[PDB]
């Protein structure tokens, strides 16, 4: 039912950082702000990721998006069935967000989430990056995706299908240590391999880290090395075993949370079928210090 | 349950001026008469445009096209239901507009709408523009679509939503003054971005403006000059947010109701989702006088 | 419900004036013979039209496909509840047809027509054509098409769409004569713009005429000198106006019946909806004789 | 050394027939005067075809096209060294051609050509049939092609091939009656199979026909349909052995004059060879009465 | 509800000739072992083929593979409720298939069958043919075919079919003798024409052969050399009537039981249409000794 | 110089057995006769082989085709200078073989050659196999090609690149015995890999065997039934190392003198780089007795 992932809102300690980090590293175009919160876009959207001050140094909400009223309604009805808890945004959450209608409520572990539609877009102010790349894969996909750490893997994944809708698509056995795996779950809700993805990781982030798509290898070659140069970066280029994405990792200047930078990845539809991995990497992505 | 918009009837002060309108600047092709109205075709239809006599100058009707019988009495089984009044078309109307069944009514402010099914085609009597124009986009999309002005926006959506099967595109904030905007809601039956559209404009006409769609962008550049050359230009080439059609406007001979003239839409789907814009065009359209 | 027309039967005075029409100039493969009848083939089936001698000098049969053992039983349930009488074929019919299963009946007015499934194909023993044409448009469009000459065609129409499952596509308003024209309505059951056409005809005949679809525009044009050579065309090269099938007709050796060698028509999907034209023939077909 | 074929005079003794025929039955446009010439257009450029009052009831002229100023020297040089007598055309007639340069000539039997360069083109004006007809097919290909007639054909050969620079495509062994058959010499000067056939026929004009190719087949259906209404068919639809051309013939107002509507021919290059054929048709073309 | 064959257990006399038959001659990898079973991939999967010591010199499993656990709980349900018994896989068994979940049961006559779900993929050990052989073609269409001996084809067919989903593509009627025939009927799960096909044949086996489908028309070429060298041809190249694949067949070191190496076959969908054939090959296939 | 081949002449014992067998096992279409000589057509030509009665039973003739009178003329040249004889075709032997100009000498050993220009078309009469054959591919690379066996290989090459300006594409060690082996030149003159291919092969015939090539793989496959009921085939399928042609041979009824069957060759062209090659063949082709 959710049918993608639109937006992401950080409270972090070092806003000038992120805005560094956002724009002269990671390409997003600086678009304004809201409130306390300065506005970063990545497309046609009004924006995309919202980044505000605040000791939680972690995400501090995710915008879930439907196609229209109804759905939206549709969804009241689905957390109103499943007991899920949530208030319907007022005028002025509306105005913030720029969204037409939402529903804010939380995943079973804290994570703020809001239901939105209608979302505000300006292509009449076409989005110009603020670093080399040629444009980022968003569209019918949503904005990217992002890893959300949860200590019941079995309670976030009744959650997210039963309640919202996602659709596992593969597992990923992560090897923590020599006798330890943590079993990572990867879900859909549209042609994107993963929009959301669980794992009981012993990390004290909301999430491990969220991924934006470019629109070329090249994007993503020179994008590593503008974050090396900040001295940012955490994992070689590599691709995944599930997703096939080539891409590489950095740190955000929030500490323990990442962010991935990839490229053509798979995407999913309806004859999609579950398997198995042993690992995140079919090459590349070796750890970096 | 509407599939496209087929045919539109206007009452005006001038034929004469509307016929060297449609023909020798549009580039439409003059198909006879059917009564006291003048008929204009765009493709293979007997006709797509009817003009006749009346102190009006406005959209007389509008022709909802169906796909077949079964389709005609199951709209006649909604009206029904909705309690709209309505009035099957007799023998004579159905010879009149060329179609095999009718349905007569009016949206909930006075505009005449038909219902039909089984319209007429001459391949016989291939389609020559009376004006150099490479051809017209109509097909599945129908003729193309129109601005509906109503006094209230919610009922009139609805009327097109819940009682003929509209779907809502997108809404743009039209401004209209300083603290004035015009939410206007566009809304499509098929595959044509938007068939109709409606807005609470503060105009005296049933309609803000008619739209035609050419085959190629050069079609658009010299009918561009041809209406220029005649005076009626009341904008610029210019791009819209939510089609992206590349168009221009013009006056029509009728006072406030304007013409449309553009290319290479964006067309919808079952993926469509519903967004907001604050402006009416993503470059250009500059407001001519 | 019936998916294609798969084979066509015909009783004729004189087999050897039809099996030299069938072959040097239709093009046709000969296929042995099946009781007392002579096959002939188009393509992969084991026959696709039997000809048999008999006073008639008519369609004698027309099979009917459907793909599988459980879509016939669907059919007899069909025609059950229609109340339509018909007779499971039995081993020697099956054995004569090469097919798995079929039921005989009767249209309202006489035609003997069976809904077969299982039908027998040969692909050790390669189409052959006997005079040069390219190769034959069957596959999921079945072999062709044949117009019905009916006494009453809504009780005709009631009987195809509402038994068997075809589906109006337009309407033609054959001239006749000054004030006398003959609503020919055109159905299809797959993607071929129509496999059955129903006329009310003056004609004495079955069937006014059955029509082969060729490969290449050539296939055509090389078919008219032959069966011109051989004397026997009724109408010039041209091109509807419903399906736009490039064709031309001629006599069959069994009069007042004809037989339409065409290329390049139109087909038909879910989003066809239903128009009516005035002539059959958007350029040529001048009726020669 | 000629690349083209841009244009054609013809002095008739009918020029409103004419004006009617080359515009309301071939579908030229109408393209205003020079001189006593009525002008009409098939393209971009300011003209194609023009028509003068005259008895002859012939074509008056040919215009060959070369690519600039120096192939035009360069053709001079030819002539010059082939002993072929020409006269440089003056301002006036460079005015009346619409063209930068030009040399006046005749080729070994009388007919009057024009070598020229810098054509005037008017994009500015678009190209508007005067009758149902997408398009012709012209470009680097010239306006068409037109059959010459000679006394001598060995003597035309050597003219168009050996001083022009044309170059010998295929024969065909036109039968002329029992035991005749005049060998008719297709010759190209860039892709178009022929512009230019040189034949030994009984007839009293200086050509056998001119032609036009349109870019449709729809185009040739409908423009025959046209020309039967006009009474002036000569011949039926029919594929060429040699070039492939669809065509149909009929008459212009100018008595053993005829024009040729055709369309999808093959195109030759480098790898041409020459070949015989017995017949001009393929298919189709039965003369017609 | 089975959405394709994902493996295959055999129980083998000779496992040193088997695995150098796979490997050498076919070209499959050798993937270590599972317990005192050999394992060997074709592509992604950990293994596709098991091969562990037994008298039995025959298929030992065959695991068809849905495409979650729901499905699989869905299958379940149906098994339950067609009577059929099953023990749902411990574990250990489930550590040994390398899958999340499976259901042990066995069809009408013997034959162990593992419904399962989440196989395992290593795509961090790219496949690696230990022969030529560009690659094998699976994915959506599981692993490739067998064709299953049974004594009662009609007992066999139902179950397949209305317990396990299967769907009749077509039959062939395989001539055994004189007056002899054995009507296998071939069934499909998804886009390959079959994945399981039933045959009364006089075999002591199982099953008749298991097919693997190459790249490459030389990837079957080459094989074939291969396997000729070996010394176990069984057959020659050639291509059958319903698939439509170009493939050989040659012995595996079981006695009775072969191996089909074949490619560019012809798949099925939903038009798909059941069809009968009196061969099973339309060109070569000539039974070797 | 010499573009392509385009005919062979047959000088044979059993012209009955040749007719069956280059129409019904070949697929060839019987073209009538010219003097004592069968024809036979593969395309639109008049005819491509020819086969007269003779106690040679062998080629008696092959006809080397360039693209005009000007090409034959410079053949002429050539010849001329390297003082090979050659005598012009006179009127008769032009008319028998239906070319406009020819050339009529030896090859260094024996080989009577035709070079000619202006061979006859008669696409009027379409053709038509009389076998189950797609087509052959001929055009631009003539009509297929023939190993001719030479006692002085060195000698030969010189004549026909020399000479007749054929190029060498590779050489193929073909073995003999256990320390014999005979190097195979293959020639081109086209696109064709090889038109000609010399080879000192211990054979009492001037050619070894003619190569035709068809349209599709199952034009192949199907011929090679056919030719195997013939008791014919000398060799299974398979695909050359260096052309990569996919064929079969096979005995025609002239002893030691065969036929090969081929598909999907791969072409030359100027970057074509001279290779050697240890076998005849990648895969396949195995003789057979
Ligand atoms: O896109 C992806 C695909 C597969 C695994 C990961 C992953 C890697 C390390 C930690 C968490 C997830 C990922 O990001
Ligand atoms: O196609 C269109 C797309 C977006 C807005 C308009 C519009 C502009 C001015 C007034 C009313 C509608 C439109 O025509
Ligand atoms: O394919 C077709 C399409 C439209 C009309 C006819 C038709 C013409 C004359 C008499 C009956 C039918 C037809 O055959
Ligand atoms: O395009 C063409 C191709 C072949 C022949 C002719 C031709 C026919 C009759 C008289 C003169 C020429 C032609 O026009
Ligand atoms: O792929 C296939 C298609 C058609 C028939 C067979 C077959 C042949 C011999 C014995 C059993 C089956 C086959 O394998
Ligand atoms: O096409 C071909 C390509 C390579 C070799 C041969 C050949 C084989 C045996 C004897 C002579 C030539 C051939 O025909
Ligand atoms: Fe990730
Ligand atoms: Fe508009
Ligand atoms: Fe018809
Ligand atoms: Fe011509
Ligand atoms: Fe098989
Ligand atoms: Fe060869």
């Given at each position: ?197 669980l794992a009981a990781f012993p990390i004290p982030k909301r999430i491990h880290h969220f991924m934006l798509q470019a629109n070329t290898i090249d994007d993503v070659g020179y994008a590593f090395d503008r974050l090396d140069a900040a001295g940012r970066i955490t994992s070689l280029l590599g691709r995944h075993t599930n997703d096939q994405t080539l891409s590489f990792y950095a740190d955000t200047p929030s500490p323990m949370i990442e962010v991935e930078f990839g490229w053509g990845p798979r995407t999913v539809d ?20």
């Amino acid at each position: 039912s959710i049918e993608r992932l639109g937006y992401l809102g950080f409270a972090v300690k070092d806003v000038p950082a992120w805005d560094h980090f956002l724009t002269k590293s990671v390409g997003l175009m600086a678009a304004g702000s809201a409130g306390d919160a300065a506005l970063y876009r990545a497309d046609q959207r009004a924006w995309r990721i919202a980044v505000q001050p605040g000791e939680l140094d972690d995400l501090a909400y995710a915008g879930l998006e439907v196609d229209d009223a109804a759905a939206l309604e549709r969804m009241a009805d689905k957390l109103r069935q499943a007991g899920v808890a949530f208030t319907r945004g007022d005028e002025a959450l509306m105005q913030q967000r720029k969204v037409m209608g939402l529903l804010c409520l939380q995943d079973p572990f804290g994570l703020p989430l809001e239901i939105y539609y209608g979302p505000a877009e300006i292509f009449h102010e076409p989005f110009l990056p603020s670093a080399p790349v040629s444009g980022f894969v968003t569209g019918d996909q949503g904005i990217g995706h992002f890893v959300r750490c949860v200590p019941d893997t079995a309670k976030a994944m009744a959650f997210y299908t039963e309640v919202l809708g996602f659709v596992l698509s593969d597992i990923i056995d992560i090897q923590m240590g020599p006798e330890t795996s943590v079993p990572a779950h990867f879900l859909h809700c549209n042609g994107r391999h993963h929009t959301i993805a669980l794992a009981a990781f012993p990390i004290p982030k909301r999430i491990h880290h969220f991924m934006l798509q470019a629109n070329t290898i090249d994007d993503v070659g020179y994008a590593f090395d503008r974050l090396d140069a900040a001295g940012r970066i955490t994992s070689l280029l590599g691709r995944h075993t599930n997703d096939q994405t080539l891409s590489f990792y950095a740190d955000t200047p929030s500490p323990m949370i990442e962010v991935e930078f990839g490229w053509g990845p798979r995407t999913v539809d309806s004859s999609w079928t579950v398997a198995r991995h042993s690992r995140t990497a079919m090459w590349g992505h070796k750890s970096v210090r």
